[PDB]
Design a protein around this ligand. Structure first.
Ligand code: CLA
Ligand code: CLA
Ligand code: CLA
Ligand code: CLA
Ligand code: PHO
Ligand code: LMG
Ligand code: LMG
Ligand code: LMG
Ligand code: SQD
Ligand code: BCR
Ligand code: BCR
Ligand code: OEX
Ligand code: FE2
Lengths: 336, 346, 30, 76, 31, 253, 84, 68, 51, 30, 37, 35, 30
């Protein structure tokens, strides 16, 4: 028509008729995730071993170097680099990039930029369909959690080596070293997040049971119960008064939601608020505000010290403090 | 029925038991209510007044200075190791104030908790049959029972004592968790790796379905407080399953299309997770743990250049075992020179 | 290598794979 | 009767739960402040953990013989 | 008044006020 | 149509196919044990029993044959330190071939009851439809359950007709299969007493017979009928699954 | 009736002395890896607890199917009688 | 329609014949509850024996007991 | 006896196992060939020590 | 040897994820 | 003899094929790390 | 009813948050005070 | 033994076996 080249282009990005919606976050999400995906696969398979700690003992992380799926990892950037922006072109040779912890910092910068914008297009499509916009808020609870383990925690420590590796056994070392230095289990933000998922799983097992247990009889018994629902129907597929009536007898009548719109808000609000504190937990633990510490706290008269369980957890932490980075510490404090 | 049989005393008792009330008693209430009440009441008594100085050798009460985090109803000592510690039995012999001192108030709570959990699951059966529903709420609660029975009962009945059970306290769990990392390497048991995916996967279905419903609602009121516009007896649904399909179909790629299958999928993901983690504790009760990979312990034995994070984790498990087990297992009477424990430097 | 490692995996993949294919192909021909 | 709103508004409620409530609280104060709680349950006082015989944490190591043994470790 | 609902409250409400007398007096115990 | 997990409930209506399936599952379980025995005796090392014993070699079904009195192979070796005078027909190889010919027998019986599923034995009178007298059918199996339990104790353990069971010394240094005599006092409940085993099967064998004649003769109450839902084929299934893990915790312990 | 005072040999047998008694083996006959295993007492116990604890779920599901047989296909239309 | 009639089917026919007949009232149910409460007490014998929670004079419950 | 010193050996304990360590116990640490005799650990002053 | 067996099973899972998006059973309204 | 009137049919739609094949491959990614040790 | 509910919850809710401050006060002094 | 001997046989058996079963089961359901 009389439309420009640009208007032809903007009526394609914001077109909802596409199989996967792009939108304007997706024009910079899609080339960042396909960057970060395609480099994650290669370094998980063919990365040469990385000096993680700067002491020139390279750690293996590739499947081609005698690892399996569980011990495979993408090894973090070396301790000598620290927080210096280390792209591919600052290295002289390409193998100097790989040995120093190259593809960790390439992935994380494209990953975190990708998931900030995957949250963006969850808003953007919801504006293109007339939906209410707050699904993008609920995706910020993992985005707050993933920003902390990759970016907010290496800032407070000063190096990308202390961030979390991209591996299954790589994660498990990061959980151990963290609690040895910061005692995460004795921090009320990790206590909220633990209740965020034990409550979150309970509120899914309980809600999903009662909707299944109040289904209306529409099929036979040889046919599955999922055939009673036909897609896009108007009438309700389960009795709601019967499930409040059941759950009202179960504990007491005031302990239930009869308003199903107030119910589904509670299912959204409980884990999302819970993950927000355990995302802010290690965000504050990144700036060295560890947790509780009740060592040598219960004492009697005559100046003696009684053990508690907190002194037992001390012995676990003290056994891991003196073992992580085994050839690094030249000095009797772990300030770094 | 329909032939005029007479009424007996048992029939008369049933009407009082299955009478509608502010709290439902039923027949299962005779098993539930005196067994559940003594469990938590036996927990609050032990965490407040009852020591642990003779069993483990460490204070555990509010009457000793331990706060809410560090108070625990502690397990018995490893001397008994499998006794039920009856208050009349030979380890106690009637004396109550010496019965608590041997840690026997642990077994008062664990055993009265088990018959509580049977009774509470039976509670969900007779309420469902009264209202004539389907039993799926009862079937989901078996997965908390399988976690309870395997961890607190099958695991000490496989290990060397009730001593190695968890104690009913906050920080006392925190060593039991840290017990399983060093001594078992429990994070590499795939039965726990399928437990985590059940827990974190069900936390994700609680957050999406609660937000997809809340953002695809139908405009039925005029006040912007959209909770006001729900008559719960209405025949139509309150949100748009068509629109919610097309959102995640273009955001994520594949979405639900079946409201019956969806809530059942929210049933299946947490229940399979715990049931596939009750199997892993059974292997730990026999110490059939997935501690090692053979083909990397060999390669790290002959070469001081090869390592992974796996071999860095085996050293950290040695740091938990060789350090805390001096105080954690006092029945083993073992002492350590400060040269026999592994360290790094400085 | 476990000699029975790759062939306990191969039977674990192919036999329930071929189980689900049989039920699906008779379904889609209805 | 009693839909739970009228209970927490009536004055016959607050003429009963203003007398039995502190009398249950003060009796809870006396149970520990008079030293009764240390002996009815058996937790040691702060001047009672270590006796003159032992100077470390107690330890049983005998199953059927624990009742008389703990009475030695208690210092009694 | 001996109601099933009343017993459920006073089976819990009576021992919890007895215990709050204990812990508050535990806070004023010196070393 | 069905889902994939309700496919075996076509059997729940008619009685006749349910025998045919329960024969097929019985043919596999035996045919495992015949296959597991022949596999293992072909990889057994009878050389050094004092120091490379039977248990260390890593072995599953052959101690369960040895415990009830099978100590000789057709190869001519024994366990305890001698060779075979004559193995007889019931040896390691013969018991291994006993289950497989049993398995091919029970395979064929499944094929018969699958084709001739419709029998007048099953269609009861005064309705003319498929039913099962579920209490009376229990008395017929419970009678024959204790009758095999009585016969095992009086004969196979006592040594009147069978060989006995394995009995060791306290420290494993010796021991073999001799007949034992039952112990009836409080020692019969010592689990390390072998005499309690023969005492158990004679005592529990009699009571199952007396319970077997009870449940044949006494019809259940109408109040207890509708409570435990006697008229359905699945109330026995949920209870037989309930009984068998009570067994499996005792057996594992 | 031998003696050794060798600084390598004493450690080489004191490490073996933790394991109970001292032995000689042949790790070339079966190509042994050097790390232990579990006796069939241990394997039989594992199978018949994992089976048993799984059969506990089977008892519930078929136990719940017999009692709730009438409403297996989903509940009926009107069950709104139960409102107090 | 009729079924199929076999020689062994007519023989076992009166065994699977009276499907449905029950006793009115309560029957032998109170007599059944006697045997359950005994058998539950019987298990508390052999458990608290085998837990060594009750000690008898002729058992000692070790491997030594098995060897006379 | 040689047998009673063989039952007292932690490599025969089934709790010293692994979940994914397949096969025989003899595949773990070889077929036992012979007993090597009871070690006794003497001090420089001849005082016997215990492991 | 197993380093190529692992990469088969990784890209095998990514195979279904391609087929589960674009070749899905199309949901039909009403 | 007579045709059995209990003949039922089994079906597995495409959205259930994808849960099946993705179930099998994922735990085959899981456990194959342990089978080879 | 007689007494308005809103100053019932204020008086109780003050005496609950007044009660919590003692347990924080008792955390730095007395037993378990680490001194 | 050829390590790839028993697993080239096993794939030779099971994959054309499962090929013919799929075509037969959709046939007999007509
Ligand atoms: C119904 C609820 C219920 C249940 C299931 C249990 C269950 C249990 N309790 Mg708890 N308890 C309860 C109510 C309950 N209790 C109440 C209400 C109280 C307050 C008084 C207690 C107080 C309490 C204490 C203080 C203790 C227990 C203990 C126990 C355990 C031991 C069981 C035992 O030895 O009983 C054995 C008895 C039976 C199983 C009854 C069987 C019925 C018999 C066979 C009928 C025959 C009677 C006949 C007349 C006998 C004739 C004898 C003649 C020859 C002289 C068990 C877990 C102990 C424990 O926890 O272990 C550490 C313990 O120390 N309970
Ligand atoms: C004595 C044992 C027994 C028997 C006879 C039955 C019989 C039945 N069950 Mg039940 N069930 C049992 C144990 C048993 N169950 C246990 C222990 C569990 C807990 C896991 C269940 C859980 C269960 C559920 C959740 C359901 C049934 C259903 C059914 C019905 C059809 C089964 C079907 O279509 O499966 C078809 C099976 C397949 C197509 C193959 C399954 C493949 C399995 C999972 C793995 C491969 C088998 C394995 C290698 C063999 C090893 C056996 C093991 C014992 C060693 C039928 C009435 C269904 C029902 O009642 O709906 C009407 C149903 O939905 N059962
Ligand atoms: C002359 C009489 C006589 C004698 C000498 C015996 C002798 C014996 N009987 Mg027999 N018995 C007899 C008559 C006799 N019986 C009669 C008349 C009956 C009635 C038919 C029985 C019924 C019977 C049964 C049902 C059992 C015995 C058992 C035993 C053995 C003693 C207990 C034992 O070994 O401890 C070991 C066994 C136990 C301590 C039983 C533990 C039961 C626990 C509570 C089950 C736990 C499951 C539960 C669900 C918990 C799981 C969850 C948990 C992990 C958290 C011994 C061989 C037991 C046996 O089989 O021996 C192995 C047994 O279970 N007897
Ligand atoms: C013809 C009879 C016969 C005989 C003599 C044998 C003999 C043998 N079989 Mg074979 N077997 C047979 C039939 C037979 N089998 C059949 C028909 C099957 C198919 C199901 C099998 C399947 C089979 C397997 C799978 C295995 C054997 C094994 C064995 C060996 C040891 C059996 C053992 O210790 O079990 C001990 C039996 C028990 C502990 C069961 C006790 C009964 C329980 C507790 C159930 C009780 C419930 C009941 C209702 C009781 C209530 C009544 C009471 C109240 C009165 C032995 C060589 C084992 C072996 O060594 O491999 C070769 C083995 O693994 N057999
Ligand atoms: C730690 C996590 C956790 C807790 C605290 C918890 C708690 C609860 N869940 C319940 C229900 C459920 N939860 C379910 C699935 C799940 N539940 C999960 C995890 C949990 N569930 C998970 C992960 C799932 C997913 C499978 C379902 C499906 C239900 C219900 O339907 C049920 C309900 O209706 O909720 C309202 C309630 C049980 C009522 C009851 O038996 O009281 C009676 C009390 C008894 C029987 C005494 C128990 C005694 C215990 C076992 C031992 C004593 C422990 C001490 C008292 C406390 C020790 C505390 C220390 C650890 C600090 C209760 C609110
Ligand atoms: C106790 C020792 C063991 C005894 C075992 C008895 C098992 C069978 C009991 C009857 C089962 C039954 O008929 O349910 C049948 C009844 C149904 O009963 C019918 O109900 C109809 C409803 O319209 C009509 O009212 C009929 O008149 C009525 O007969 O099911 C129930 O109501 C629930 C029963 C719950 C189980 C009760 C078990 C009792 C166990 C404790 C007994 C002792 C309590 C003091 C301690
Ligand atoms: C059925 C066909 C479809 C499936 C095909 C098979 C796929 C699964 C394979 C089995 C699981 C993987 C096991 C290891 C594979 C392997 O290499 O085996 C290899 C091993 C043999 O291992 C070798 O053995 C040799 C002789 O002993 C030597 O010792 C060698 O050193 C040793 O490596 O084979 C087995 O042991 C398999 C036995 C499995 C039987 C069950 C054992 C566990 C018992 C408890 C059951 C738990 C049930 C839980 C239920 C929930
Ligand atoms: C029905 C009533 C059931 C009530 C259950 C909850 C109460 C648990 C016990 C609390 C207690 O004993 O604190 C009592 C303790 C006693 O306070 C302690 O006293 C000691 C005396 O020697 C020392 O002075 C300690 O330093 C001091 O902390 O208070 C605390 O430790 C501080 C915490 C204060 C807040 C307590 C309430 C916690 C509420 C959260 C409960 C879990 C919620 C999970 C879901 C969200
Ligand atoms: C990154 C990639 C890495 C490598 C990938 C390896 C993948 C391996 C796993 C493949 C999983 C296949 C599962 C089943 C797929 C399915 O059911 O599709 C069903 C669709 C139905 O689409 C239908 O098509 C119809 C049109 S028409 O009739 O077909 O013309 C239409 O009517 C209907 O709506 C539509 O649904 O069938 C097709 O149209 C395409 C054929 C699919 C069958 C071939 C798949 C196998 C070959 C894959 C490539 C080689 C891999 C080597 C190993 C085989
Ligand atoms: C052992 C025993 C027994 C029992 C007893 C009992 C049962 C008791 C009970 C008890 C109880 C029953 C108790 C209770 C308690 C409670 C408490 C102690 C509480 C506390 C709390 C707190 C401290 C907190 C609070 C709060 C919260 C929650 C939060 C917010 C704030 C407030 C403050 C509000 C018997 C007899 C069997 C036998 C003998 C001995
Ligand atoms: C997966 C798995 C499992 C399972 C397994 C199984 C299940 C197995 C089985 C196996 C089996 C189950 C086998 C069987 C076999 C059989 C056989 C091998 C048989 C044979 C037979 C025959 C050959 C016969 C013949 C004949 C006939 C037919 C006619 C008559 C005569 C005669 C004899 C000739 C489990 C989980 C446990 C674990 C491991 C893995
Ligand atoms: O980097 Mn990973 O962990 Ca933060 O402390 Mn020092 O440095 Mn290292 O050690 Mn401790
Ligand atoms: Fe919902």
């Amino acid at each position: 028509e009389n439309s420009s080249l640009w208007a032809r282009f903007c009526e394609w990005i914001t077109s909802t008729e596409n199989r996967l919606y792009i939108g304007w976050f997706g024009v910079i999400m899609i080339p960042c995730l396909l960057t970060a995906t395609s480099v994650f696969i290669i370094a998980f398979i063919a990365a040469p071993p990385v000096d993680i700690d700067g002491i020139r003992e390279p750690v293996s992380g590739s499947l081609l170097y005698g690892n399996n799926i569980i011990t495979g990892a993408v090894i973090p950037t070396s301790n000598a680099i620290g927080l210096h922006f280390y792209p591919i072109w600052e290295a002289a040779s390409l193998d100097e990039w790989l040995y120093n912890g190259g593809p960790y910092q390439l992935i994380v910068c494209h990953f975190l930029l990708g998931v900030y914008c995957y949250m963006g297009r969850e808003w953007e499509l919801s504006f293109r369909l007339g939906m209410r916009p707050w699904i993008a808020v609920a995706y910020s609870a993992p985005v707050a959690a993933a920003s902390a383990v990759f970016l907010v925690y290496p800032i407070g420590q000063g190096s990308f080596s202390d961030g979390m590796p991209l591996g299954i056994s790589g994660t498990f070392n990061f959980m151990i070293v963290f609690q040895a230095e910061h005692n995460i289990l004795m921090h009320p933000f990790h206590m909220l997040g633990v209740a965020g998922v034990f409550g979150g799983s309970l509120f899914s097992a309980m809600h999903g049971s009662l909707v299944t247990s109040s289904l209306i009889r529409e099929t036979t018994e040889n046919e599955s119960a999922n055939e009673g629902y036909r897609f896009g129907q108007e009438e309700e597929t389960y009795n709601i008064v019967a499930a409040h009536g059941y759950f009202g007898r179960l504990i007491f009548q005031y302990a239930s939601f009869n308003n199903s719109r107030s119910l589904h808000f509670f299912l959204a609000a409980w884990p999302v608020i819970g993950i927000w504190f355990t995302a802010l937990g290690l965000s504050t633990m990144a700036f060295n505000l560890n947790g509780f510490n009740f060592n040598q706290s219960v004492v009697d008269s005559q100046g003696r010290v009684l053990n508690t369980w907190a002194d037992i957890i001390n012995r676990a932490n003290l056994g891991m403090e003196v073992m992580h980075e085994r050839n690094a510490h030249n000095f009797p404090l772990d300030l770094a | 029925g329909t032939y005029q049989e007479k009424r007996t005393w048992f029939d008369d008792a049933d009407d009082w038991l299955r009478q509608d009330r502010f709290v439902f008693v039923g027949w299962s209430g005779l098993l539930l209510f005196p067994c559940a009440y003594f469990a938590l009441g036996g927990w609050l008594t032990g965490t407040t007044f009852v020591t642990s100085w003779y069993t483990h050798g460490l204070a555990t009460s509010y009457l000793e200075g331990c706060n809410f985090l560090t108070a625990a109803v502690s397990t018995p000592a490893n001397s008994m190791a499998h006794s039920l510690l009856f208050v009349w039995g030979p380890e106690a012999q009637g004396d109550f104030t010496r019965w608590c001192q041997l840690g026997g108030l642990w077994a008062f709570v664990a055993l009265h908790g088990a018959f509580g959990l049977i009774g509470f699951m039976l509670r969900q059966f007779e309420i469902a049959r009264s209202v004539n529903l389907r039993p799926y709420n009862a079937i989901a609660f078996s997965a908390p029972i399988a976690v309870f029975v395997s961890v607190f009962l099958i695991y000490p009945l496989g290990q060397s004592g009730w001593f190695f059970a968890p104690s009913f306290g906050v920080a006392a769990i925190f060593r039991f968790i840290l017990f399983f990392q060093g001594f078992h390497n429990w994070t590499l048991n795939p039965f726990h790796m399928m437990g985590v995916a059940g827990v974190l996967g069900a936390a994700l279905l609680c957050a999406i379905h609660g937000a997809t419903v809340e953002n695809t609602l139908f405009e039925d009121g005029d006040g912007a407080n959209t909770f006001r516009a729900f008559n719960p007896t209405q025949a139509e649904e309150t949100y748009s399953m068509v629109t919610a399909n097309r959102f995640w179909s273009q955001i994520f790629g594949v979405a639900f299309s079946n409201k019956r299958w969806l809530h059942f999928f929210m049933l299946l993901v947490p229940v399979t997770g715990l049931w596939m983690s009750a199997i892993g504790v059974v292997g730990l009760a026999l110490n059939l743990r997935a501690y090692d990979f053979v083909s990397q312990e060999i390669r790290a034995a002959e070469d001081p250049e090869f390592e992974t994070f796996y071999t860095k984790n085996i050293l950290l498990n040695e740091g938990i075992r060789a350090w805390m087990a001096a105080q954690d297992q006092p029945h083993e009477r073992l002492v350590f020179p400060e040269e026999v424990l592994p360290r790094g430097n400085a | 290598v476990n000699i029975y490692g790759l062939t306990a995996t191969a039977l674990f993949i192919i036999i329930p794979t071929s189980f689900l294919l049989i039920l699906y192909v008779k379904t889609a021909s209805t | 009767e009693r839909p739970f709103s009228d209970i927490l508004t009536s004055i016959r409620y607050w003429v009963i739960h203003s007398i039995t409530v502190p009398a249950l609280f003060i009796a809870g104060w006396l149970f520990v402040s008079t030293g009764l709680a240390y002996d009815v349950f058996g937790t040691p006082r702060p001047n009672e953990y270590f006796t003159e015989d032992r100077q470390e944490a107690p330890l049983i190591t005998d199953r059927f013989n624990a009742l008389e043994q703990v009475k030695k470790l208690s210092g009694n | 008044i001996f109601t099933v609902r009343w017993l459920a409250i006073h089976g819990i409400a009576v021992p919890t006020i007895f215990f709050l007398g204990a812990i508050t007096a535990m806070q004023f115990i010196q070393r | 149509g069905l889902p994939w997990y309700r496919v075996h409930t076509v059997v729940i209506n008619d009685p006749g196919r349910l025998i045919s399936v329960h024969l097929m599952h019985t043919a596999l379980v035996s045919g495992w044990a015949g296959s597991m025995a022949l596999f293992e005796i072909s990889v057994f090392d009878p050389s050094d029993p004092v120091l490379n014993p039977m248990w260390r070699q890593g072995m599953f079904v052959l101690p369960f044959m040895t415990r009830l009195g099978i100590t000789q192979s057709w190869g001519g070796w024994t366990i305890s330190g001698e060779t075979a005078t004559n193995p007889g027909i019931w040896s390691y190889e013969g018991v291994a071939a006993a289950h497989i010919i049993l398995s091919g027998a029970l395979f064929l019986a499944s094929v018969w009851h699958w084709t001739y599923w419709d029998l007048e034995l099953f269609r009861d009178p005064r309705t003319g439809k498929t039913a099962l007298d579920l209490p009376k059918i229990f008395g017929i199996h419970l009678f024959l359950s204790g009758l095999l339990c009585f016969g095992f104790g009086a004969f196979h353990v006592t040594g009147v007709f069978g060989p006995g069971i394995w009995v060791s010394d306290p420290y494993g240094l010796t021991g073999r299969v001799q007949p034992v005599a039952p112990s009836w006092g409080a020692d019969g409940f010592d689990p390390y007493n072998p005499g309690g085993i023969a005492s158990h099967h004679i005592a529990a064998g009699i009571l199952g017979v007396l319970a077997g004649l009870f449940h044949l003769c006494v019809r259940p109450s109408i109040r207890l009928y509708f409570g435990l839902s006697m008229g359905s084929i699945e109330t026995v299934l949920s209870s037989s699954i309930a009984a068998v893990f009570w067994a499996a915790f005792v057996v594992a312990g | 009736g031998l003696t050794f005072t060798d600084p390598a040999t004493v450690k080489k047998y004191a490490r073996k002395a933790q394991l109970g008694e001292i032995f000689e083996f042949d790790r070339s006959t079966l190509q042994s890896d050097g790390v232990f295993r579990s006796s069939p007492r241990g394997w039989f116990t594992f199978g018949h607890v994992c089976f048993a604890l799984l059969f506990f779920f089977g008892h519930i599901w078929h136990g719940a199917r017999t009692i709730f047989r009438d409403v297996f296909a989903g509940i009926d239309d009107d069950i709104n009688d139960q409102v107090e | 329609e009729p079924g199929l009639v076999t020689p062994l089917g007519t023989l076992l026919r009166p065994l699977n014949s009276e499907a449905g007949k029950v006793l009115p009232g309560w029957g032998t149910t109170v007599l059944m509850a006697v045997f359950i409460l005994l058998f539950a007490a019987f298990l508390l014998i052999i458990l608290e024996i085998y837990n060594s929670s009750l000690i008898l004079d002729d058992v000692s419950m070790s491997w030594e007991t098995l060897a006379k | 006896p040689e047998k009673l010193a063989f039952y007292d050996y932690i490599g025969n304990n089934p709790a010293k196992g692994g979940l994914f360590r397949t096969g025989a116990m003899n595949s773990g640490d070889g077929i036992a060939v012979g007993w090597l005799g009871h070690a006794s650990f003497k001090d420089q002053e001849g005082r016997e020590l215990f492991v | 040897m197993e380093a190529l067996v692992y990469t088969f099973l990784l890209v095998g899972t990514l195979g279904i994820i391609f087929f589960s998006i674009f070749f899905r059973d199309p949901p039909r309204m009403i | 003899a007579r045709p059995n009137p209990n003949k039922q049919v089994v079906e597995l739609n495409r959205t259930s094929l994808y849960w099946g094949l993705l179930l099998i491959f994922v735990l085959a990614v899981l456990f194959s790390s342990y089978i080879f040790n | 009813g007689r007494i308005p509910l809103w100053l019932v919850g204020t008086v109780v809710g003050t005496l609950a948050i007044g009660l919590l401050a003692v347990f924080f006060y008792g955390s730095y002094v007395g037993l378990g005070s680490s001194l």
